[PDB]
Amino acid sequence: MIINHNLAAINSHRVLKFQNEEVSKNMEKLSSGMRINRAGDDASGLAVSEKMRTQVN
Amino acid sequence: MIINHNLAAINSHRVLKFQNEEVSKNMEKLSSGMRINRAGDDASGLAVSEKMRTQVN
Amino acid sequence: LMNAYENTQASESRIRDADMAEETVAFTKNQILVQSGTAMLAQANVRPQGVLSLL
């Protein structure tokens, strides 16, 4: 067995970090209470939402 | 994962601060019974309302 | 006088009173870092034990 590298550890760490990214994004989105909080998630949705907010005001 | 800076906590606190500010504004508006209250909410409305109050007196 | 008292108290609270939600995160971060540091110190204490086998 090769001990110079731990490919299983590398893969697990990569999956862990790319899941932590998603959990942080979801927690931010839910704590803000808004689906389109701050991103390029839905560009058209954000544009239409801002236009609708201006119309509401 | 980086533990020197809890960015999710920072974002949640940032949202919470402004939410509490809006809560306080709404509470003061409820307690006073007047929409304008202090200046900056609607400067033109406040000026016109003062003029109408003088007219009423 | 009542209005001035209210505004002055608000300003004094703003510039002196701590925001508990603002540094609860800092406190938890600091104790987490303390735990990590003490774990690393415990790990490094037994580090030189590997040389005893050579004697």
PDB file of C-alpha atoms in Angstrom:
ATOM      1  CA  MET A   1       0.000   0.000   0.000  1.00  0.00           C
ATOM      2  CA  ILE A   2       1.255   3.474  -0.907  1.00  0.00           C
ATOM      3  CA  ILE A   3       1.620   5.762   2.113  1.00  0.00           C
ATOM      4  CA  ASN A   4       2.972   8.799   0.239  1.00  0.00           C
ATOM      5  CA  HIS A   5      -0.601   9.840  -0.595  1.00  0.00           C
ATOM      6  CA  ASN A   6      -4.112   9.021   0.621  1.00  0.00           C
ATOM      7  CA  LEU A   7      -6.320   9.201  -2.463  1.00  0.00           C
ATOM      8  CA  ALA A   8      -9.370   8.111  -0.465  1.00  0.00           C
ATOM      9  CA  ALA A   9      -8.697  10.918   2.014  1.00  0.00           C
ATOM     10  CA  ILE A  10      -8.265  13.389  -0.854  1.00  0.00           C
ATOM     11  CA  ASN A  11     -11.563  12.361  -2.451  1.00  0.00           C
ATOM     12  CA  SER A  12     -13.420  12.470   0.867  1.00  0.00           C
ATOM     13  CA  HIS A  13     -12.023  15.927   1.642  1.00  0.00           C
ATOM     14  CA  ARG A  14     -13.008  17.205  -1.805  1.00  0.00           C
ATOM     15  CA  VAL A  15     -16.564  15.899  -1.450  1.00  0.00           C
ATOM     16  CA  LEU A  16     -16.725  17.293   2.090  1.00  0.00           C
ATOM     17  CA  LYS A  17     -15.691  20.787   1.005  1.00  0.00           C
ATOM     18  CA  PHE A  18     -18.014  20.830  -2.004  1.00  0.00           C
ATOM     19  CA  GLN A  19     -20.879  19.765   0.269  1.00  0.00           C
ATOM     20  CA  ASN A  20     -19.983  22.376   2.888  1.00  0.00           C
ATOM     21  CA  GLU A  21     -20.217  24.980   0.128  1.00  0.00           C
ATOM     22  CA  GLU A  22     -23.782  23.891  -0.660  1.00  0.00           C
ATOM     23  CA  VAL A  23     -24.830  23.717   2.991  1.00  0.00           C
ATOM     24  CA  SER A  24     -23.484  27.230   3.594  1.00  0.00           C
ATOM     25  CA  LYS A  25     -25.309  28.537   0.521  1.00  0.00           C
ATOM     26  CA  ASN A  26     -28.589  26.922   1.582  1.00  0.00           C
ATOM     27  CA  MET A  27     -28.279  28.134   5.176  1.00  0.00           C
ATOM     28  CA  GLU A  28     -27.583  31.693   4.006  1.00  0.00           C
ATOM     29  CA  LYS A  29     -30.541  31.560   1.612  1.00  0.00           C
ATOM     30  CA  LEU A  30     -32.911  30.262   4.281  1.00  0.00           C
ATOM     31  CA  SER A  31     -31.729  32.604   7.057  1.00  0.00           C
ATOM     32  CA  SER A  32     -32.183  35.580   4.738  1.00  0.00           C
ATOM     33  CA  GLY A  33     -35.693  34.290   4.035  1.00  0.00           C
ATOM     34  CA  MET A  34     -35.364  35.033   0.312  1.00  0.00           C
ATOM     35  CA  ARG A  35     -34.811  32.555  -2.509  1.00  0.00           C
ATOM     36  CA  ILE A  36     -32.699  34.932  -4.637  1.00  0.00           C
ATOM     37  CA  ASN A  37     -30.559  36.344  -1.849  1.00  0.00           C
ATOM     38  CA  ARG A  38     -27.251  37.463  -3.396  1.00  0.00           C
ATOM     39  CA  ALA A  39     -25.947  35.678  -6.501  1.00  0.00           C
ATOM     40  CA  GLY A  40     -26.369  35.058 -10.202  1.00  0.00           C
ATOM     41  CA  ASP A  41     -28.715  32.224  -9.267  1.00  0.00           C
ATOM     42  CA  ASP A  42     -31.566  33.275 -11.579  1.00  0.00           C
ATOM     43  CA  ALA A  43     -30.596  36.401 -13.515  1.00  0.00           C
ATOM     44  CA  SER A  44     -34.003  36.673 -15.186  1.00  0.00           C
ATOM     45  CA  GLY A  45     -35.733  35.994 -11.876  1.00  0.00           C
ATOM     46  CA  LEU A  46     -33.733  38.706 -10.121  1.00  0.00           C
ATOM     47  CA  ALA A  47     -34.422  41.221 -12.893  1.00  0.00           C
ATOM     48  CA  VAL A  48     -38.157  40.478 -12.915  1.00  0.00           C
ATOM     49  CA  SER A  49     -38.269  40.608  -9.113  1.00  0.00           C
ATOM     50  CA  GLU A  50     -36.565  44.006  -8.963  1.00  0.00           C
ATOM     51  CA  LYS A  51     -38.865  45.320 -11.694  1.00  0.00           C
ATOM     52  CA  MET A  52     -41.884  43.992  -9.792  1.00  0.00           C
ATOM     53  CA  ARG A  53     -40.664  45.615  -6.567  1.00  0.00           C
ATOM     54  CA  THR A  54     -40.345  48.956  -8.355  1.00  0.00           C
ATOM     55  CA  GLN A  55     -43.853  48.476  -9.750  1.00  0.00           C
ATOM     56  CA  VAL A  56     -45.189  47.661  -6.270  1.00  0.00           C
ATOM     57  CA  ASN A  57     -43.648  50.809  -4.799  1.00  0.00           C
TER      58      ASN A  57
ATOM     59  CA  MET B   1     -12.886  23.669   6.506  1.00  0.00           C
ATOM     60  CA  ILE B   2     -11.690  27.118   7.579  1.00  0.00           C
ATOM     61  CA  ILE B   3     -12.414  27.685  11.270  1.00  0.00           C
ATOM     62  CA  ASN B   4     -10.650  31.038  11.690  1.00  0.00           C
ATOM     63  CA  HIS B   5     -13.665  32.883  10.239  1.00  0.00           C
ATOM     64  CA  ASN B   6     -17.238  31.572  10.400  1.00  0.00           C
ATOM     65  CA  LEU B   7     -18.538  33.338   7.306  1.00  0.00           C
ATOM     66  CA  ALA B   8     -22.042  31.879   7.646  1.00  0.00           C
ATOM     67  CA  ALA B   9     -22.283  33.321  11.158  1.00  0.00           C
ATOM     68  CA  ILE B  10     -21.080  36.680   9.824  1.00  0.00           C
ATOM     69  CA  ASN B  11     -23.744  36.699   7.106  1.00  0.00           C
ATOM     70  CA  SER B  12     -26.499  35.664   9.518  1.00  0.00           C
ATOM     71  CA  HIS B  13     -25.500  38.391  11.980  1.00  0.00           C
ATOM     72  CA  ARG B  14     -25.387  40.940   9.156  1.00  0.00           C
ATOM     73  CA  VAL B  15     -28.938  40.054   8.130  1.00  0.00           C
ATOM     74  CA  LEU B  16     -30.119  39.973  11.752  1.00  0.00           C
ATOM     75  CA  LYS B  17     -28.787  43.458  12.520  1.00  0.00           C
ATOM     76  CA  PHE B  18     -30.780  45.131   9.747  1.00  0.00           C
ATOM     77  CA  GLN B  19     -33.834  42.992  10.496  1.00  0.00           C
ATOM     78  CA  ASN B  20     -33.690  44.213  14.101  1.00  0.00           C
ATOM     79  CA  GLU B  21     -33.320  47.792  12.852  1.00  0.00           C
ATOM     80  CA  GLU B  22     -36.493  47.416  10.784  1.00  0.00           C
ATOM     81  CA  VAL B  23     -38.216  45.791  13.775  1.00  0.00           C
ATOM     82  CA  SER B  24     -37.339  48.794  15.943  1.00  0.00           C
ATOM     83  CA  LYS B  25     -38.558  51.213  13.270  1.00  0.00           C
ATOM     84  CA  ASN B  26     -41.876  49.371  13.024  1.00  0.00           C
ATOM     85  CA  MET B  27     -42.221  49.248  16.812  1.00  0.00           C
ATOM     86  CA  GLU B  28     -41.700  53.006  17.102  1.00  0.00           C
ATOM     87  CA  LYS B  29     -44.202  53.610  14.289  1.00  0.00           C
ATOM     88  CA  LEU B  30     -46.746  51.435  16.105  1.00  0.00           C
ATOM     89  CA  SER B  31     -46.138  53.132  19.456  1.00  0.00           C
ATOM     90  CA  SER B  32     -46.397  56.702  18.143  1.00  0.00           C
ATOM     91  CA  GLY B  33     -49.412  56.057  15.915  1.00  0.00           C
ATOM     92  CA  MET B  34     -48.009  58.348  13.201  1.00  0.00           C
ATOM     93  CA  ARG B  35     -46.534  57.220   9.891  1.00  0.00           C
ATOM     94  CA  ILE B  36     -44.004  60.043   9.515  1.00  0.00           C
ATOM     95  CA  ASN B  37     -42.555  60.243  13.057  1.00  0.00           C
ATOM     96  CA  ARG B  38     -38.956  61.530  12.806  1.00  0.00           C
ATOM     97  CA  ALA B  39     -37.656  63.137   9.632  1.00  0.00           C
ATOM     98  CA  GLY B  40     -36.179  61.125   6.780  1.00  0.00           C
ATOM     99  CA  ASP B  41     -39.158  58.794   6.410  1.00  0.00           C
ATOM    100  CA  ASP B  42     -40.850  61.286   4.071  1.00  0.00           C
ATOM    101  CA  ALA B  43     -39.462  64.830   4.087  1.00  0.00           C
ATOM    102  CA  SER B  44     -42.012  66.243   1.640  1.00  0.00           C
ATOM    103  CA  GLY B  45     -44.824  64.525   3.516  1.00  0.00           C
ATOM    104  CA  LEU B  46     -43.595  65.913   6.833  1.00  0.00           C
ATOM    105  CA  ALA B  47     -43.374  69.454   5.450  1.00  0.00           C
ATOM    106  CA  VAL B  48     -46.848  69.254   3.909  1.00  0.00           C
ATOM    107  CA  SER B  49     -48.267  67.754   7.112  1.00  0.00           C
ATOM    108  CA  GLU B  50     -46.791  70.571   9.198  1.00  0.00           C
ATOM    109  CA  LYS B  51     -48.331  73.079   6.789  1.00  0.00           C
ATOM    110  CA  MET B  52     -51.722  71.363   7.088  1.00  0.00           C
ATOM    111  CA  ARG B  53     -51.429  71.347  10.892  1.00  0.00           C
ATOM    112  CA  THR B  54     -50.804  75.095  10.867  1.00  0.00           C
ATOM    113  CA  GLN B  55     -53.810  75.493   8.569  1.00  0.00           C
ATOM    114  CA  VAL B  56     -55.950  73.399  10.939  1.00  0.00           C
ATOM    115  CA  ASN B  57     -54.995  75.500  13.957  1.00  0.00           C
TER     116      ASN B  57
ATOM    117  CA  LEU C   1     -35.461  67.187  27.695  1.00  0.00           C
ATOM    118  CA  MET C   2     -37.163  63.801  27.357  1.00  0.00           C
ATOM    119  CA  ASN C   3     -36.380  63.645  23.636  1.00  0.00           C
ATOM    120  CA  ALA C   4     -32.759  64.689  24.200  1.00  0.00           C
ATOM    121  CA  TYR C   5     -32.377  62.114  26.978  1.00  0.00           C
ATOM    122  CA  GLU C   6     -33.697  59.377  24.699  1.00  0.00           C
ATOM    123  CA  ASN C   7     -31.362  60.317  21.847  1.00  0.00           C
ATOM    124  CA  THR C   8     -28.317  60.674  24.115  1.00  0.00           C
ATOM    125  CA  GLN C   9     -29.002  57.294  25.721  1.00  0.00           C
ATOM    126  CA  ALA C  10     -29.341  55.746  22.264  1.00  0.00           C
ATOM    127  CA  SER C  11     -25.989  57.200  21.193  1.00  0.00           C
ATOM    128  CA  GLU C  12     -24.234  56.100  24.391  1.00  0.00           C
ATOM    129  CA  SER C  13     -25.602  52.574  24.009  1.00  0.00           C
ATOM    130  CA  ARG C  14     -24.504  52.568  20.365  1.00  0.00           C
ATOM    131  CA  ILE C  15     -20.912  53.540  21.174  1.00  0.00           C
ATOM    132  CA  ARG C  16     -20.435  51.592  24.414  1.00  0.00           C
ATOM    133  CA  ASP C  17     -22.906  48.719  24.800  1.00  0.00           C
ATOM    134  CA  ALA C  18     -21.742  45.411  23.347  1.00  0.00           C
ATOM    135  CA  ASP C  19     -23.703  43.588  20.652  1.00  0.00           C
ATOM    136  CA  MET C  20     -24.027  40.078  22.078  1.00  0.00           C
ATOM    137  CA  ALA C  21     -24.913  38.535  18.716  1.00  0.00           C
ATOM    138  CA  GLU C  22     -21.875  40.254  17.179  1.00  0.00           C
ATOM    139  CA  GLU C  23     -19.201  38.608  19.346  1.00  0.00           C
ATOM    140  CA  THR C  24     -20.907  35.386  20.414  1.00  0.00           C
ATOM    141  CA  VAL C  25     -19.559  34.085  17.097  1.00  0.00           C
ATOM    142  CA  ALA C  26     -16.127  35.467  17.990  1.00  0.00           C
ATOM    143  CA  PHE C  27     -16.239  33.765  21.398  1.00  0.00           C
ATOM    144  CA  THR C  28     -17.201  30.411  19.886  1.00  0.00           C
ATOM    145  CA  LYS C  29     -14.489  30.774  17.233  1.00  0.00           C
ATOM    146  CA  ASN C  30     -11.932  31.540  19.934  1.00  0.00           C
ATOM    147  CA  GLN C  31     -12.842  28.534  22.071  1.00  0.00           C
ATOM    148  CA  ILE C  32     -12.839  26.271  18.998  1.00  0.00           C
ATOM    149  CA  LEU C  33      -9.345  27.529  18.190  1.00  0.00           C
ATOM    150  CA  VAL C  34      -8.363  26.888  21.817  1.00  0.00           C
ATOM    151  CA  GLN C  35      -9.552  23.289  21.472  1.00  0.00           C
ATOM    152  CA  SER C  36      -7.603  22.874  18.228  1.00  0.00           C
ATOM    153  CA  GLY C  37      -4.492  24.386  19.795  1.00  0.00           C
ATOM    154  CA  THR C  38      -4.628  22.151  22.853  1.00  0.00           C
ATOM    155  CA  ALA C  39      -5.154  19.086  20.652  1.00  0.00           C
ATOM    156  CA  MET C  40      -2.127  20.069  18.568  1.00  0.00           C
ATOM    157  CA  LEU C  41      -0.061  20.711  21.704  1.00  0.00           C
ATOM    158  CA  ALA C  42      -0.959  17.274  23.061  1.00  0.00           C
ATOM    159  CA  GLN C  43      -0.022  15.732  19.708  1.00  0.00           C
ATOM    160  CA  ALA C  44       3.305  17.584  19.581  1.00  0.00           C
ATOM    161  CA  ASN C  45       4.196  16.648  23.169  1.00  0.00           C
ATOM    162  CA  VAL C  46       4.557  12.962  22.226  1.00  0.00           C
ATOM    163  CA  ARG C  47       6.311  13.771  18.933  1.00  0.00           C
ATOM    164  CA  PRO C  48       9.923  13.074  20.073  1.00  0.00           C
ATOM    165  CA  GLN C  49       8.942   9.597  21.310  1.00  0.00           C
ATOM    166  CA  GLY C  50       9.747   8.180  17.869  1.00  0.00           C
ATOM    167  CA  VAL C  51      13.493   8.536  18.468  1.00  0.00           C
ATOM    168  CA  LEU C  52      13.550   6.266  21.529  1.00  0.00           C
ATOM    169  CA  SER C  53      13.302   3.199  19.281  1.00  0.00           C
ATOM    170  CA  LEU C  54      16.744   3.981  17.838  1.00  0.00           C
ATOM    171  CA  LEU C  55      18.388   3.600  21.261  1.00  0.00           C
TER     172      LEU C  55
END
